[PDB]
Amino acid sequence: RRRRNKMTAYITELSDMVPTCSALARKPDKLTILRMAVSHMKSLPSFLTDQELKHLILEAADGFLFIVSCETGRVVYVSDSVTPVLNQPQSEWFGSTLYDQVHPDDVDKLREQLSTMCMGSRRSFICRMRCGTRNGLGSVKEGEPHFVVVHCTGYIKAWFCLVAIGRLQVTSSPTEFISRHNIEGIFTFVDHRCVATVGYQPQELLGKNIVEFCHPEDQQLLRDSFQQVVKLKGQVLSVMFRFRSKTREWLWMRTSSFTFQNPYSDEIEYIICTNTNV
Amino acid sequence: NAARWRRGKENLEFFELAKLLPLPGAISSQLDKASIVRLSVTYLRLRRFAALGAPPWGEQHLGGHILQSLDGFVFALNQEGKFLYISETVSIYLGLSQVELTGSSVFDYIHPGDHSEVLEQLGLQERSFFVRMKSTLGYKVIHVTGRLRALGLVALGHTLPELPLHGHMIVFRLSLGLTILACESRVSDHMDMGPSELVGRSCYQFVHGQDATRIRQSHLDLLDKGQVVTGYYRWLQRAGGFVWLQSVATVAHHVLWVSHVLSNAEGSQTPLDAFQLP
């Protein structure tokens, strides 16, 4: 039946994973395969050692185990995984305060956790943490310190203290600039990169139409393309035209845009342009 | 008659192989022959899998604290998709046995129809998807976050998301199109708007233009699977600037939108949208 051929299919693969048993010309009998596996394993908290588990959490979501005191905030324990995750040396983290290691604005929340709430009670919070000798919450500033967003989960366990994992959730943090328009072409949002792209400040574009900044030879194309991205529904349509900077120079500019459709009601929320310098 | 003796020696060997598995006595002792061989194989395979990958994997109370410190389960797939490891704590959230899943194909426990997407994520290098998994407590939406290796995934599964709100998180009640129905008056502890000045508008109006597309994709997954977690995104404030949020959302034909507040206001000088004028 289908059970017995299945087990012989297990046993042969077992012969492959047993070294003393695979390096054979002829596969031995079931009894000898079993015997060989038993001694092989005899020459060697479930499946994984505490070390192995620490390194797996590290590979999986850049997680390190730490313990803090629920009143002082003293780091009473930190995993060495804290070095690959935060680029802190273990000694800088051990004994230091958790409140000194988080971002100045995130201290109130770190203090509303760990305050007095039984034993085995849970904690979970997001808070930023200083990197030292990579950031993940918006465009990196200039020569400022990096703070990574760290996801802390843990329980309360006396000699009162917090046992926690801090792990990174990197797949969340995110020359050109994005803008939004109504269907008529009216700037109703300008990302700040526009200052560096065409010299203007966002409000100096807001409320005006994009075609107004458009070289007169090119305006008819740009009007046409806008009325087109309206008819194209979701799909993207790009056009190159000349854009009058604030230095009064004309810059060649490839803008790809599309109509942003509400995934439920399917109404048009606005038009998302990505305006680029060529 | 000689077959009896041969099978007796085989049985004795199976007993031994069961004793040597890295499981508790009480669990391994109650296994059948077929599963003793399965766990033996995949455990040797697991040894191989941790051998590869950098580093090779490897106060001794550590692993217990790690596992009970996560709010989800930890697992490792091979290039095929068979579980090479899953933490006992899967039983906490899906009620599946670690002993049952180990060695099995993940697809035997993924809702079919999420099969295609899951197959796409393993390649069949960070990963982050939402998937329905078999729960017996008749599926649960599981957020998987992890890494692919170019050949096997290593990741965390978290159930989504009773309702413990804390200080730095505002609840919204939204329509299925993300227009704001109701808002905690607490929002004003972190933002310039009160529930008077938010209800009636669409979240798409408040998402910074660079995150509209990411929030939209999240809205898609929200209507598709019933629960979603956004990335870190920016919510525009009434003066200017924005506050960073991460949000967990579930459907109830209305939408619950729990926003963890991640930062105080940033760049509040420069306005960006129309609604930030005059």
Numbering used by the authors:
A (entry chain A): 99 to 142, 156 to 227, 255 to 271, 290 to 315, 335 to 349, 361 to 464
B (entry chain B): 52 to 109, 135 to 200, 244 to 256, 267 to 279, 282 to 292, 298 to 388, 397 to 422
Which statements did the authors publish about this structure?
One family of transcription factors in mammals is known as the bHLH-PAS family, which consists of sixteen members including NPAS1 and NPAS3. The mammalian bHLH-PAS transcription factors share a common protein architecture consisting of a conserved bHLH DNA-binding domain, tandem PAS domains (PAS-A and PAS-B), and a variable activation or repression domain. Proteins in the bHLH-PAS family have to form pairs in order to bind to DNA: NPAS1 and NPAS3 both interact with another bHLH-PAS protein called ARNT, but it is not clear exactly how this works. We employed the contiguous bHLH-PAS-A-PAS-B segments of NPAS1, NPAS3 and ARNT proteins for our crystallographic studies.
For the NPAS1-ARNT heterodimer, we obtained crystals that diffracted to 3.2 Å resolution. We found that the bHLH, PAS-A and PAS-B domains of ARNT twist along the outside surface of the NPAS1 protein. Figure 1D shows that NPAS1-ARNT and HIF-2α-ARNT heterodimers are very similar in overall architectures, but the PAS-B domain of ARNT is slightly displaced in the NPAS1 heterodimeric complex. We show that NPAS1 protein’s PAS-A and PAS-B domains do contain internal cavities with volumes measuring 190 Å3 and 180 Å3, respectively. We could not detect any major change in the cavity size or shape of ARNT’s PAS-A and PAS-B pockets, whether this protein was in a complex with HIF-2α or NPAS1. Mutations in interfaces 1–4 were found to significantly destabilize ARNT’s heterodimeric interactions with both NPAS1 and NPAS3, as predicted from their crystal structures. Point mutations within NPAS1 at interfaces 5 and 6 also destabilized heterodimerization with ARNT. NPAS1 has been shown to function as a transcriptional repressor on its target gene tyrosine hydroxylase (TH), since it lacks a functional transactivation domain.
